[PDB]
Design a protein around this ligand. Structure first.
Ligand SMILES: Cc1cc(N2CC[C@@](C#N)(C3CC3)C2=O)cc(NC(=O)Cc2ccccc2)n1
Ligand SMILES: Cc1cc(N2CC[C@@](C#N)(C3CC3)C2=O)cc(NC(=O)Cc2ccccc2)n1
Lengths: 486, 486
């Protein structure tokens, strides 16, 4: 059983759920986690979706080396200043020192763009559109969180190069909406699109667009995915020039974008409850578990009939016919593992040519005739997804408090909210705001009390004529979301 | 153009083909290579096939960490003795030394089996069946070869644990036949199944079964895939015990198996010719390229009609309508890249409601009426695969010389053959044979002249009553394939 309540001890709840549902195994290197089959299956689902969608944009998958030389790694100025203390270095093979130490990729801009100039010489070579499915390493000494913040993680990283700004920026936002769909249609998680503040954008980017999620039970925002307009910054550093149709040398305009197995953690944190994992049907291997209750051969034959009915309509299920466990053990076993639907069959159900169908998300039960099971299961799978999404969306909406003064912020943070505030967007105020909110959090978590700029939402409320910045008192430019975060 | 002939300067031919066909880009770390989209597409095809097939055996995909501790890495005795001098070690993050240095996986037995004992406690937990799609690192200082022998490579590694020997061994050979199908049905490459000699089997294995391929143009064998029966050797080292139905503690019987992007290199070396890449249709993104020859709008409309006909029947193609290049440039451009079929359309073809269809593998051309194109393309794609396979199979068969005495070996090796020889299988003769054949190769390649035991073929000729070992003169046990190798 899960022995900590989600609302009472969130972190212990989370670790219990991910271990006991067999998603995650811990490892003897801190910040590294094993993805067991149930977790990797979710990854494969979203991988298939995203592959299908980026193929329509003519992005092609590729694979680049795990390692980068000092030479290539330092061509980036703001980029390496961002990543340098968490880049892991290989220095030895066996007991012998390498002739030159080499670094493991934290992200692959410097690796890929080292060869982009050979591939791009003319406007005819554009656009160039690549993606990798790989793992990267960011070896930090902050507290890790399984799925959410790890030292090694699986992701996809896309990289494109275009003849001008307009085409690149359009691709940036097309990708951002694909991430919206990845979260909503497969994980049933709502996100907020926005632009990062200057202090929080990717090193080397012109701007960083972002999808933000929020975990209302512990008041913490989590960046769900990211899509950068790099402009010509990397093209200047790596000399990625092309001859345009007027025979003029130009720099390419670049994008890069990423989304990780953090998405799985966001889904777990969003939908999981005190009984364990709750899976949206689109990322659940088994849509239905059939559990018999005890003639035992009549029940066996009936449950296998139902299994045939579901599998014949391409609905994968499992009939838990294990002889040594009670029905209630099985109920709990499969609720912990997040199976969306349980079908129960006892003798009274068989006599009625009926069965009991039980939704994982709200535990509502109903009697369904045998011949109606297929249809009723299909409808229910759809309705479960919608319910999960809508419940999460209400929580997301209820997590935002609009403020005009810093005097309202701490109260909102302590109620596990984010704030939407008018802001002048000056980069120095970012650190000032972080430090003051951290200082004032003195009035249970292990994570920091500091509030960060999360994103400037694409959907802006009107800015009244003379509204001042909630922090500096200077004229406010736009509304920006702030909160504590992972 | 390819400027070296396959038969005259094989290595320069190979490097030209893989670069100019845009499969591979070289990198500023030796032995590491970029897989450009055309190469990665082949990987994705065989990945999809193998996933589908291992799912039928109830193998589940997973993902384990890139890194392993000294602790876990040394529990293996023969395994670490095998891998230790080519294990790469991470010792630093940024400029700070790690508190404990950690190793990059050369293969994941020690990583996965460190946690197997927590997952396997009862006969109810068996069999356990896992697979990973990942990359591994084997940092050797021998000469690398793109695709064939690299310091980092993509692969799949499967690992299973069973209640007894019979079940494990059956899975070993089921996997070996899946590798046979991977090579034959997608890459059109024939292989030879066999068992490794004791000197060549995997460190820690009970036995190693193998699929061997042979490149007749330079006389070199290449191991195509591998499937190990590990017995209880790793179970003893990692204490993977389970309670059986008689309540007796037993060790699991384990398997592990692997197949890499080396398969792509084998395909290139097998089917490539003096014009460049030759792709089996099942791993070619474009099955057909349509090339116009010059009313230009009539030809454009006709070629697009044909493109619609092919794409409507789920046959991906490309219409090369680029205005600045001649037809012959385009012919060569797409032959270099291995497209299986070229359709040419000039005015005489349009007047005849016809077109010219040209096979990449033998350059045979024929006139096909418009309404017959779909059908004729389908048949031709099938026939191209069969032809590629059968041609390769003839070469493989012609590459084996049966000998009874060492006196016949060097002659055969110099004619770019392998030898099938009666052998006593004593492990010390392996090094003796290697050293003597290397010594005698004195009478152009950069690779070693040494001959190795390749495999003991599953399909054995009869062993005559008193046949002696071709090397030691002692009684021969079985026939074994020997040759030079990659
Ligand atoms: C699993 C995961 C994800 C992500 N990040 C980042 C932003 C981003 C987004 N959106 C990426 C661009 C795509 C994301 O998902 C980041 C991470 N580790 C780290 O920062 C390193 C680390 C390790 C231990 C403790 C603290 C920090 N770990
Ligand atoms: C691309 C590839 C493949 C394979 N091997 C091995 C046997 C096997 C088979 N069958 C694996 C078990 C599955 C295979 O494919 C091995 C390798 N590198 C190496 O030995 C390291 C190396 C690096 C530079 C020069 C020389 C050697 N590189």
């Amino acid at each position: 059983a899960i022995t900590s309540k989600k609302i009472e001890n969130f972190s212990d709840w989370y670790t219990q759920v991910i271990v006991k549902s067999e998603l995650i195994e811990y490892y003897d290197i801190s910040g590294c986690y094993i993805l067991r089959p149930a977790a990797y299956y979710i990854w494969e689902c979203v991988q298939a979706f995203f592959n299908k969608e980026i193929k329509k944009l003519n992005v092609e998958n590729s694979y680049f080396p795990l390692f980068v030389t000092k030479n290539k790694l330092e061509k980036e100025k703001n980029h390496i200043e961002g990543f340098s203390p968490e880049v892991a270095w290989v220095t030895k093979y066996g007991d012998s020192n390498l002739p030159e130490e080499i670094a493991i990729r934290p992200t692959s801009e410097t690796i890929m763009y080292s060869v982009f100039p050979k591939w791009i010489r003319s406007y005819r070579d554009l656009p160039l559109k690549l993606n990798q499915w790989n793992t990267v390493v960011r070896w930090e000494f902050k507290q890790p969180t399984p799925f959410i913040r790890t030292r090694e993680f699986l992701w996809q990283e896309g990289h494109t190069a275009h003849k001008n700004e307009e085409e690149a920026v359009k691709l940036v936002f097309d990708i951002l909406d694909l991430y919206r769909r990845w979260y909503e249609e497969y994980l049933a998680v709502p996100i907020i699109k926005g632009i990062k503040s200057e202090g929080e954008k990717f090193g080397g980017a012109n701007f960083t667009s972002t999808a933000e999620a929020f975990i209302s039970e512990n008041g913490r925002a989590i960046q769900a995915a990211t899509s950068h307009y790099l402009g010509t910054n990397f093209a200047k550093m790596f000399k990625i020039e092309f001859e345009d149709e007027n025979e003029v040398k130009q720099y390419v305009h670049q994008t890069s974008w990423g989304c990780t197995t953090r998405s799985i953690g966001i889904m777990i944190m969003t939908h999981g409850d005190d009984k364990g994992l709750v899976l949206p049907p689109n990322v659940s291997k088994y849509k239905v578990v059939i559990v018999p209750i005890f003639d035992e051969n009549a029940i066996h034959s009936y449950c296998k009939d139902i299994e045939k009915i579901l599998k014949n309509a391409q609905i994968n299920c499992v009939y838990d016919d294990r002889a040594s466990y009670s029905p209630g053990y099985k109920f709990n076993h499969w609720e912990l593992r997040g199976i969306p639907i349980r079908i129960e069959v006892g003798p009274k159900d068989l006599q009625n040519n009926s069965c009991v169908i039980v939704r994982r998300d709200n535990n509502e039960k109903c009697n369904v005739k045998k011949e109606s099971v297929l249809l009723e299961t299909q409808q229910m799978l759809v309705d479960i997804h919608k319910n999960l999404f809508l419940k999460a969306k209400k929580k997301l909406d209820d997590s935002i408090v609009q403020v005009t003064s810093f005097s309202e912020v701490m109260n909102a943070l302590n109620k596990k909210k984010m704030v939407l505030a008018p802001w002048c967007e000056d980069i120095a105020t970012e650190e000032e705001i972080k430090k003051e909110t951290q200082r004032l959090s003195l009035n249970e978590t292990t994570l920091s009390g500091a509030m960060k700029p999360l994103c400037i939402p694409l959907d802006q409320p009107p800015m009244p004529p003379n509204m001042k910045c909630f922090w500096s008192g200077k004229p406010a430019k736009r509304w920006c979301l702030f909160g504590r975060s992972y």
